[PDB]
């Protein structure tokens, strides 16, 4: 891809004491036109991994096809496919990062930013980021694009250090994620009111919530705003 055409907005995520939470809106925009509504940008790979993708939608669909192919290939000649030989978030991220960097090296990148979230077999949380240049990094909170400027400051209020992870319950983390989504809908012009969220927990299973809408907003004070400067 040399230039994106249909693009999705930011994906936000954070780790808490037991698992990870990730979220993204359901809008595919076409150059300032809010063209497509109902685009799922969170892809669950198995029961312990969710991949959130932002950027070009066609490249996102290509990546979804690659992930499904990877699952099918892992299932071949593997009686422990639903066992200790199942795919792990680390494997998936390493594969995706290899693909991204190789395609960057060929001047034919996948114009995307990707967050892989999940829980390892030993129970440790996993949360990592890789973009169209192949740059990878990890942090207790992750966000790409616009969210990286507005979601990260709020989420880092809850989990500012690695030591804050054991203190953070799932309820607090989910409330913070929802509030960050509301802020993004307030201030991002390419965003949508409808989004999806995913919780990966080490004790309970994967919980995938769809059709989540930004709740009660503050708009009443707008009635007090008169014309600019000196009017009225």
């Amino acid at each position: 891809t040399q230039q994106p055409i249909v693009t999705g907005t930011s994906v936000i995520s954070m780790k808490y004491d037991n698992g990870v939470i990730i979220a993204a809106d359901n809008l595919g925009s076409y150059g300032s036109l809010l063209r497509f509504n109902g685009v799922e940008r969170l892809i669950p790979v198995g029961d312990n991994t969710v991949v959130g993708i932002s950027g070009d939608i066609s490249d996102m669909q290509h990546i979804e096809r690659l992930l499904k192919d990877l699952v099918t290939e892992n299932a071949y000649d593997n009686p422990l496919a639903d066992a200790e030989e199942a795919l792990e978030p680390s494997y998936i991220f390493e594969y995706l990062a290899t693909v991204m960097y190789q395609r960057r090296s060929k001047m034919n990148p996948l114009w995307n930013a990707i967050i892989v979230a999940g829980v390892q077999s030993n129970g440790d949380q996993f949360l990592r980021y890789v973009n169209l240049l192949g740059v990878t990094y990890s942090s207790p909170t992750l966000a790409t694009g616009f969210g990286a400027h507005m979601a990260n400051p709020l989420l880092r209020k809850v989990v500012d250090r690695e030591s804050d992870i054991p203190k953070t319950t799932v309820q607090v983390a989910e409330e913070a994620i929802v509030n960050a989504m509301r802020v993004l809908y307030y201030r991002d012009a390419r965003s949508s009111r409808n989004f999806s969220l995913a919780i990966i927990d080490k004790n309970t299973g994967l919980t995938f919530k769809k059709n989540l809408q930004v709740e009660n907003m503050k708009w009443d004070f707008a009635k007090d705003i008169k014309g600019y400067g000196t009017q009225k």
Binding site: D77, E84, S90
Partner: protein, 231 residues
């Protein structure tokens, strides 16, 4: 016999004679024994030398930190297969950050061997392999023949006069199965098993090689004085 010229010719009864000749090449090699428990896997190899002034031929090759093998037959074929296995393990680690399973490596060796018995211009490999490893499923031992057949076993032996060691392993299966947490005992069981295939020689520090992998043990090779305590 007019049907033994190449590997693309069936016999009237449906036999591939070049494959059988490669198996015969295996049967003339030095005996090697493989054994395992729920926590460890062990290879025992008897080396051979050309004469007294010569060194002994190495028989154990490390494939990866969690995997290795021992050979019986044509050594350069073992080198080719070992290099292929090293490349495959390295690819798995580099691309998926994942340790290659022993069963998948056996499948890869089977697929690589099959292609050499169906097309003109290439011969089948002339070596048999015993592969030990430890992965997320525990300890594993595999036996590979150049016909492409790969089998997973608790213990086995290949090479000349390996039948006695195989009978010993089959008799004492329930004993060495449960040698967990005591690597020295498993190594001694393997040495006793390989002692059943000796006729006119005794185990020394020059002709005995041992390899071990396990739950906390990377694939390690002992030879020379390092095996003196197991004799």
């Amino acid at each position: 016999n007019n049907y033994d010229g190449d590997t693309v010719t069936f016999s009237p009864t449906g036999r591939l004679f070049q494959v059988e000749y490669a198996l015969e090449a295996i049967k003339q090699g030095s005996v090697t024994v493989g054994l395992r428990s729920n926590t460890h896997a062990v290879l025992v190899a008897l080396k051979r030398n050309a004469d007294e002034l010569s060194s002994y031929q190495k028989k154990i090759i490390k494939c990866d930190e969690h995997m290795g093998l021992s050979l019986a037959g044509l050594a350069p074929d073992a080198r080719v297969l070992s290099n292929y296995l090293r490349q495959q393990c390295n690819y798995s680690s580099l691309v998926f950050n994942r340790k290659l399973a022993v069963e998948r490596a056996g499948h890869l060796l089977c697929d690589k061997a099959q292609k050499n018995t169906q097309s003109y211009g290439g011969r089948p490999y002339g070596v048999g392999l015993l592969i030990i490893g430890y992965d997320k499923s525990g300890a594993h031992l595999l036996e590979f023949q150049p016909s492409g057949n790969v089998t997973e076993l608790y213990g086995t032996a290949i090479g000349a006069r390996s039948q006695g060691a195989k009978t010993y392993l089959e008799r004492t299966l329930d004993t060495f199965i449960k040698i967990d947490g005591n690597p020295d005992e498993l190594i001694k069981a393997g040495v006793e098993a390989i002692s059943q295939s000796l006729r006119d020689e005794s185990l020394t520090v020059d002709n005995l090689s041992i390899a071990i992998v396990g739950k906390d043990t990377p694939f390690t090779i002992y030879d020379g004085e390092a095996v003196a305590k197991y004799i």
